[PDB]
Design an enzyme around this catalytic site. Structure first.
Site, mmCIF file in Angstrom:
data_model
loop_
_atom_site.group_PDB
_atom_site.id
_atom_site.type_symbol
_atom_site.label_atom_id
_atom_site.label_comp_id
_atom_site.label_asym_id
_atom_site.label_seq_id
_atom_site.Cartn_x
_atom_site.Cartn_y
_atom_site.Cartn_z
ATOM 1 N N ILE A 189 0.878 -1.154 0.083
ATOM 2 C CA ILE A 189 0.042 -0.076 0.057
ATOM 3 C C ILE A 189 0.913 1.155 0.039
ATOM 4 C CG2 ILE A 189 -1.756 -1.350 1.215
ATOM 5 C CD1 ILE A 189 -1.199 0.181 3.774
ATOM 6 N N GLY A 190 2.211 1.320 0.485
ATOM 7 C CA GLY A 190 2.862 2.382 0.530
ATOM 8 C C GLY A 190 4.472 2.348 0.524
ATOM 9 N N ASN A 191 4.769 3.511 0.104
ATOM 10 C CA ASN A 191 6.474 3.432 0.269
ATOM 11 C C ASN A 191 6.949 4.283 1.277
ATOM 12 O OD1 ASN A 191 7.235 2.001 -2.547
ATOM 13 N ND2 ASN A 191 5.512 2.792 -2.676
ATOM 14 N N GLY A 192 8.337 4.471 1.238
ATOM 15 C CA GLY A 192 9.058 5.309 2.084
ATOM 16 C C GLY A 192 10.506 5.143 2.258
ATOM 17 N N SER A 193 11.043 6.132 3.275
ATOM 18 C CA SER A 193 12.560 6.184 3.576
ATOM 19 C C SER A 193 12.762 4.995 4.329
ATOM 20 C CB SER A 193 12.376 7.260 4.704
ATOM 21 O OG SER A 193 11.363 7.652 5.208
ATOM 22 N N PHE A 194 11.789 4.291 4.962
ATOM 23 C CA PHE A 194 12.071 3.035 5.683
ATOM 24 C C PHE A 194 12.143 1.795 5.110
ATOM 25 C CE2 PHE A 194 7.941 4.800 5.565
ATOM 26 C CZ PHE A 194 7.143 3.752 4.803
ATOM 27 N N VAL B 293 9.006 -0.368 2.992
ATOM 28 C CA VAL B 293 7.706 -0.785 2.437
ATOM 29 C C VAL B 293 6.620 -0.972 3.404
ATOM 30 C CG1 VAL B 293 6.772 -2.257 0.851
ATOM 31 C CG2 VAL B 293 9.090 -2.099 0.557
ATOM 32 N N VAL B 294 5.324 -0.623 3.123
ATOM 33 C CA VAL B 294 4.194 -0.709 3.742
ATOM 34 C C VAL B 294 3.174 -1.903 2.986
ATOM 35 C CG1 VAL B 294 2.613 0.370 5.688
ATOM 36 C CG2 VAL B 294 4.513 1.862 4.369
ATOM 37 N N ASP C 22 5.682 15.047 12.429
ATOM 38 C CA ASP C 22 5.372 14.522 10.997
ATOM 39 C C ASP C 22 3.860 14.554 10.867
ATOM 40 O OD1 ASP C 22 5.527 14.278 8.326
ATOM 41 O OD2 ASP C 22 6.411 12.287 8.383
#
Ligand SMILES: COCCNC(=O)c1nc(-c2ccc(S(=O)(=O)N3CCN(C)CC3)cc2)cnc1N
Length: 347
Positions: A27-32, A34-35, A146
């Site tokens: 569902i999601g991406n990011g710095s960390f 994957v979601v 944030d």
């Protein structure tokens, strides 16, 4: 396809358990990393797995914070466990959280594409719930860092808000420096735009005011192409800060971007057909002086939310309003006598 992992409860006694899940969807991406979205085989309920790469010679900051939090308006950490990729070093910390279907950004974004404004009751509902979550984490000394509409989750039917993404949250220990390029721009407090490293939890309060004003205006109140342009747009509306105001924001900097530009009224910022206690809340949230901004607890008791405290007020789809009065003593700690206003009649 059923995946079974040994996960430690994110609240409970330190007792690793067999957890089985399926229906794994990104569902999601990011710095960390994957979601994902997934379904627990046993309980059939939906969850989110936030997967971060973890180096073992320092504990994950988010994880230590998640295992100390538990609130109605915050996505709760159910489990955590560790996976790996190919080779070793390559440890992934996985956080099993509650899944909430929608976000404030994607709601706010549609009304804007429809050239419409979000109904005022949803503004009150979602801001109040955000404040509660803020007053709770600030009572521990934890600052999210944030606040943005896409980090607020919503259930469309129950109108429950749950704050998520604690990747930038941090326990603020007074005397330890704290970085200034935190917050997702637009909602980046004045102190941080000037590069201050001596900030308090009031930076989430600022970001919340930027979220409030965005839901009122139908678009971000303080845009900008960089950190510098954010200062231009803040100064456009709130005027040039006084030199006392500058001293309170950052006790470091002032490299005049340009001259003193002066302020223009709050009444002229928003749409005419919607100027109630909503403008008064923005003028108490978006102030240069960090100590002059409301507490999230003091914001909940503001005039603008008084409709929600009425025992007869009901959701637009006819249903009951979600829990808005089930406070803890930790949540009331900043101002215990405020329970006079927070908990109305009605039980
Ligand atoms: C790193 O910081 C935390 C990362 N995120 C969480 O932890 C978390 N995210 C969500 C979430 C909710 C809505 C969406 S969506 O844009 O509306 N949509 C995107 C695609 N998809 C097909 C439908 C959903 C995406 C994710 C829910 N619960 C969570 N517990």
């Amino acid at each position: 396809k059923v995946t079974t992992v040994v996960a430690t409860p994110g609240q409970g006694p330190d007792r690793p358990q067999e957890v089985s899940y399926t229906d794994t969807k990104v569902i999601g991406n990011g710095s960390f990393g994957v979601v994902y979205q997934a379904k627990l085989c046993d309980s059939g309920e939906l969850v989110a797995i936030k997967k971060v790469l973890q180096d073992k010679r320092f504990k994950n900051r988010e994880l230590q914070i998640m295992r100390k939090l538990d609130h109605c308006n915050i996505v709760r950490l159910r489990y955590f466990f560790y996976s790996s990729g190919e080779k070793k070093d390559e440890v992934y910390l996985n956080l099993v959280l509650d899944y909430v279907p929608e976000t404030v950004y994607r709601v706010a974004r549609h009304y804007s594409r429809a050239k419409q404004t979000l109904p005022v009751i949803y503004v009150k509902l979602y801001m109040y719930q955000l404040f509660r979550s803020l007053a709770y984490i600030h009572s521990f000394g934890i600052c999210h860092r944030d606040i943005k509409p896409q980090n607020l989750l919503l259930d469309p039917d129950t109108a429950v808000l749950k704050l998520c993404d604690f990747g930038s949250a941090k326990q603020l220990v007074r005397g330890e420096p704290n970085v200034s390029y935190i917050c997702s721009r637009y909602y980046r407090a004045p102190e941080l735009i000037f590069g201050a490293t001596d900030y308090t939890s009031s930076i989430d309060v600022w970001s919340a005011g930027c979220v409030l004003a965005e839901l009122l205006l139908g678009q971000p109140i303080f845009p900008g192409d960089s950190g510098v342009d954010q200062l231009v747009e803040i100064i456009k509306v709130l005027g040039t800060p006084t030199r006392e105001q500058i001293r309170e924001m950052n006790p470091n900097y002032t490299e005049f971007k340009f001259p003193q530009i002066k302020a223009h009224p709050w009444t002229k910022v928003f749409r005419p057909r919607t100027p109630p206690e909503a403008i008064a809340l923005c003028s108490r949230l978006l102030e240069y002086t960090p100590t002059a901004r409301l507490t999230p607890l003091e914001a909940c008791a503001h005039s603008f939310f008084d409709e929600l405290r009425d025992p007869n007020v009901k959701l637009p789809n006819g249903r009951d309003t979600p829990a808005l009065f089930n406070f803890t003593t930790q949540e009331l700690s900043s101002n215990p006598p405020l329970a006079t206003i927070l908990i109305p009649p009605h039980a």
